[PDB]
Symmetry: C3
Subunit: 259 residues, 3 copies
């Protein structure tokens, strides 16, 4: 192991082998840090979380194989998060409570995953992605930058279950999936699209389009939407909302010029 003198490791913490904990990481009461886990500088790991959780192969003979987990700098991981090995999480990651993240998954920077969320294996999550409470993200899902998944959203992948050939969902830049929506396997949700709350999305959703219902149906251009309090046009949301975004201190247009 390699643990920094500035790291704060509370009691009850259990540490395995081939563990690297950088500078100013704080590991709260009772976490279990299994083998092959690397936590980058400045991170906070919440009470009782279990990092580098066992992949299936461990159970064959109870011998833990090597499946490195890396968590980027300055994470703010809340209590009891369970994160599998063979996964990579970028910088400035934040979570709510009791989140579960599987193996062979990649999560970008400045991503937020809320309480109870369940990220399966072989998932791709980009940067500045916001996944709220109890969202189910099935294997093979691809979530592009700036997408928002509201509470209780479920992204599926078996088109005619149970079957052998899975098709993951792809959610393109800035699309928002409102709460309690379920997306069917292999569907493409296009850029700046809006899936209304509770929808059952059975077909691809075209860019800048709003769909609602079971089955979801297109009701209009996202541009038609007016803020309910101020009467202003809302979407694309990048010009009306910037809390926690990279253009927070400027404006989208200037920011995107620079990138």
């Amino acid at each position: 192991n390699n643990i920094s003198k500035s790291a704060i490791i509370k009691e009850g913490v259990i540490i395995g082998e081939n563990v690297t904990i950088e500078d100013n990481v704080y590991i709260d009461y009772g976490c279990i840090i299994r083998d092959n886990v690397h936590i980058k500088k400045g991170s906070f790991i919440g009470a009782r979380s279990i990092l580098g959780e066992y992949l299936v192969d461990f159970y064959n003979d109870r011998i833990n194989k090597k499946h490195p987990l890396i968590i980027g700098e300055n994470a703010l991981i809340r209590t009891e998060n369970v994160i599998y090995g063979d996964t990579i999480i970028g910088d400035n990651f934040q979570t709510g409570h009791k989140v579960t993240i599987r193996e062979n998954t990649k999560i970008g920077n400045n991503v937020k995953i809320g309480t109870l969320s369940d990220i399966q294996h072989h998932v791709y999550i980009g940067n500045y992605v916001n996944i709220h409470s109890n969202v189910f993200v099935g294997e093979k899902s691809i979530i592009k930058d700036f997408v928002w998944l509201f509470p209780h959203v479920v992204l599926t992948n078996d088109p005619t279950p149970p079957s052998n050939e899975l098709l993951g969902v792809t959610i393109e830049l800035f699309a928002v999936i409102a709460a309690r929506s379920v997306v069917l396997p292999g569907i493409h949700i296009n850029e700046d699209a809006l899936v209304g709350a509770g929808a059952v999305v059975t077909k691809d959703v075209p860019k800048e389009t709003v769909v609602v219902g079971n089955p979801a149906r297109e009701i209009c251009s996202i541009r038609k939407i007016k803020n309910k309090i101020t009467g202003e046009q809302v979407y694309p949301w990048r010009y009306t909302f910037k809390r926690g975004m990279p253009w927070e201190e400027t404006d989208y247009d200037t920011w995107i010029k620079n990138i």
Copy 2:
């Protein structure tokens, strides 16, 4: 601190500062009692729960600020509940497992919150409220006395997400929201209304009215409903159901005369 000699504190328990535990409180294995938490007499706190959980400001510099949490008398809090500071919970509170309750929230007396439920910040819950399994209660929601939220209900608050101006839902006295229903932001569910299972509630629901569907539509007066086993009129439910209610030992009419 101030801990009663009659309190039973199991092992693994971790206690912070400015903690007050009254008489005959029982704190099960491994709970973490962070600073500024007051647990009233007779309460049971389940294994591994974490009380007075850190608000966001702690993370600025890892210095825990003062945000008192008070839990009323005779709570029956199950395992692994996470409850934030700056919140008040009344007497005879009961929970299921792994419930999460945020800050700046107020919960009345004789309230029940089930397994996995997630109560966000700035929520108001009255008395004799029953929230069943895995209900998501968003910030600014106002839940009046005697309301029932069935498993997987989700109360939302961002009308055109992501946006800055939130509108909480208000659920009036005795209304029942059946399972897997989602309520849109700022909706008013009126007294004795019934939201049928799985509904997507997009408009206010008038008193004593039953709505179903996606989007929910009024189908009839709640009074039209017959018990499926006995054929008797069901609603208002206060005259047909009294298990755990304050008129349990009498009758509604006599009881309400007295209050």
Copy 3:
């Protein structure tokens, strides 16, 4: 107690009385094994799980009554599962994380229950049943062999809530309930039926029938369904899918001849 010399009991484990742990059982960090729990040979019990969790009667006077829990051979129980007393689980059981299983419940062999699932009391689950992530199974539900419940499915039981007379759902052999579906009380889902994702099932679903929508409506024979990748007829699924099934090494027809 009766604990095998071959059992591996990690630290932090807490064991009560009248506990029997067979040969080659492995109990991971911090589990709490309350009284009257019998874990059969070869089982793995994940970190921080709590087995033989207290029934309601304990709380009367904080005296734990006798409600035996038995877990069959070779379980693979993941972290933080909470399992009540007065319940029986068969052999080769596997779970995801943070699953909750209530009392007076019976679970067969080769059953899988995923992350966050919540099994209430007085539930019946047969063999080779697959319950995926965050499924809510209400009391009195009867789930027959080979049934699949996809993420976020919810089986209800109070027909006109809150009421006193509950009616459990019955899911017959091999039926599949797709994700985010809710089934109303007392409904019968017949053999080899398919409930499409997100459905609101308000009426019995006839054998080999596919229903979709809110409220769910019959759209066709399950036999009409073609695999989306291969174009082949999918159902009954027993002839097209066999991963983890008892006819995995043979074929259904030969297998069922033998049983």
